[PDB]
Design a protein around this ligand. Structure first.
Ligand SMILES: Nc1ncnc2c1ncn2[C@@H]1O[C@H](CSCC[C@H](N)C(=O)O)[C@@H](O)[C@H]1O
Ligand SMILES: Nc1ncnc2c1ncn2[C@@H]1O[C@H](CSCC[C@H](N)C(=O)O)[C@@H](O)[C@H]1O
Ligand SMILES: [Zn+2]
Ligand SMILES: [Zn+2]
Ligand SMILES: [Zn+2]
Ligand SMILES: [Zn+2]
Ligand SMILES: [Zn+2]
Ligand SMILES: [Zn+2]
Ligand SMILES: [Zn+2]
Ligand SMILES: [Zn+2]
Lengths: 258, 7, 261, 9
């Protein structure tokens, strides 16, 4: 195969806190550009998200929000983040709770314990050309278990609108409303499905608490070694449609959709 | 009748 | 003698701390409002954030050419390489500024992005001798520099007209009809504490960043001259302020050219 | 006028 070619230094055009380069050690496919990279969700037609600041629940903590008196930890069942911003080992990755991070109505500081997803993407990720799966995303560094990796970002749309979108490859159900990353998306639109995934999606609230519109944050379910491809389970709602077209090629010996 | 990913 | 009564009124929400000091009396840091670093709403304002409604540039450079659409909307791009307004900028009659946005083809570090990068200057909330709290700069600020944004709760003209506390109301438009206001009484940033001065060293400029809903400009204060380390910040609150307030107290800005005393 | 004081640009 070819020497690895750098096809973009940063697909995010400087919108993330580190670059996300795109490389291709496989073929002559250019940097994918059939979409607009956005680092945070957007709308076309109005969604009418409740952003009334008086509707936020918030905490009155006088510490770093690591005590069980933190309202925002109570809304999350407990604050699940350790000192390093990783999910505690007791976090239920099979059936995650809703996470309520602290917000601008809370009395606590911007650096309190209960603020991880709102700080954005930190890990060094790379869009790369796979052999048999199109584009995929890898980590350039070791990512310990329980680490916030990236958010599924895109265009917030209604259920009805999602049903008439010609392309459905980039649809994520909220739980109804959807995120479509087809026209507007971030790096997460390129993550492939894996039957034994190293990422789990968690529903998170931050600047608003409109329960119709959780934000989708991927956390590592295990140590992800430098070089490894990122993968999450796309779910039955996906595979029921896409299965009639093509089979899963994740190569797991515990694969469920080939 | 579109594919949606699921949390 | 000066006491530091808060190391940061912003609780870490700004890029640098904004300390509060009191060299006058025994008042603690003010706490009867909520500090917020960006505008909020209570009642919905329904700002048009349809991403397909944005006008944007297709620049292949750093947006320093006269082809940049966003510069064109601004009349021209007014920022130099250090992000300060060009000397030709009309501070008596500022144009609307349209910075680049997330729909533009350019990178996040292009020339036409200043107010969206937020407050940078080293500011300090302090107790004045006779005007309550004021805001000073802790460092020299060259002319044409973005100092801070007037941030608060976005409300209609109608609602503003019945707010009993009107010391922190800022009209976004001077016309009749459908118009909006920022109230920094209950939610606001450091700008809520800036006093009126009859010869101001700040001028408010209307700016568009993430959305271009002309009903909701954001209010960015730029320096009109070199502001020296230690100087109090001031802007001209205008006639729609003093027409009400001048019946209650006179201006104490101390300017020899004071117009409201 | 208006009923309440407004700063204006
Ligand atoms: N486990 C898997 N097996 C086979 N194809 C997959 C897959 N995961 C993702 N894909 C492909 O990628 C699409 C999801 S979008 C993910 C990025 C995509 N590989 C790209 O090149 O842009 C799917 O509809 C399918 O075409
Ligand atoms: N030039 C001036 N002369 C007299 N009072 C002023 C003034 N500029 C501001 N103020 C006072 O401050 C109010 C505007 S809000 C500015 C912050 C205020 N000093 C505070 O302590 O919270 C005015 O209504 C007036 O009460
Ligand atoms: Zn708390
Ligand atoms: Zn909180
Ligand atoms: Zn907190
Ligand atoms: Zn599989
Ligand atoms: Zn441009
Ligand atoms: Zn632009
Ligand atoms: Zn630009
Ligand atoms: Zn005066």
């Amino acid at each position: 195969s070819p020497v690895e070619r750098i096809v973009s230094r940063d697909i995010a055009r400087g919108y993330e806190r580190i670059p996300i380069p795109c490389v291709n050690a496989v073929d002559s496919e250019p940097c994918p550009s059939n979409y607009k990279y956005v680092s945070q969700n957007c709308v076309t037609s109005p969604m009418n998200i409740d952003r009334n600041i008086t509707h936020l629940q918030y905490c009155v903590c006088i510490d770093d929000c690591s005590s069980s008196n933190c309202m925002c930890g109570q809304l999350s069942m407990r604050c699940w983040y350790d000192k390093d911003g990783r999910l505690l080992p007791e976090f239920n990755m099979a059936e995650p709770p809703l996470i309520f991070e602290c917000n601008h109505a809370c009395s606590c500081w911007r650096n309190c314990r209960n603020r991880v997803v709102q700080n954005g993407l930190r890990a060094r990720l790379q869009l790369y050309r796979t052999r048999d799966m199109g584009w995929g995303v890898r980590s350039l560094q070791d990512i310990p278990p329980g680490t916030f990796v990236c958010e599924y970002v895109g265009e917030l749309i209604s259920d009805s609108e999602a049903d008439v979108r010609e392309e459905d490859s980039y649809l994520f159900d909220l739980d109804v409303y959807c995120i479509d990353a087809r026209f507007y998306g971030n790096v997460s639109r390129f993550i492939n499905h894996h039957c034994e995934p190293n990422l789990v999606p968690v529903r998170v609230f931050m600047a608003h608490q409109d329960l119709r519109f959780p934000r989708i944050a991927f956390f590592s379910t295990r140590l992800i070694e430098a070089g490894e491809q990122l993968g999450f389970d796309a779910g039955e709602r996906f595979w029921d449609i896409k299965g009639k077209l093509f089979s899963c090629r994740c190569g797991s010996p515990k694969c469920r959709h080939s | 009748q579109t594919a949606r990913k699921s949390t």
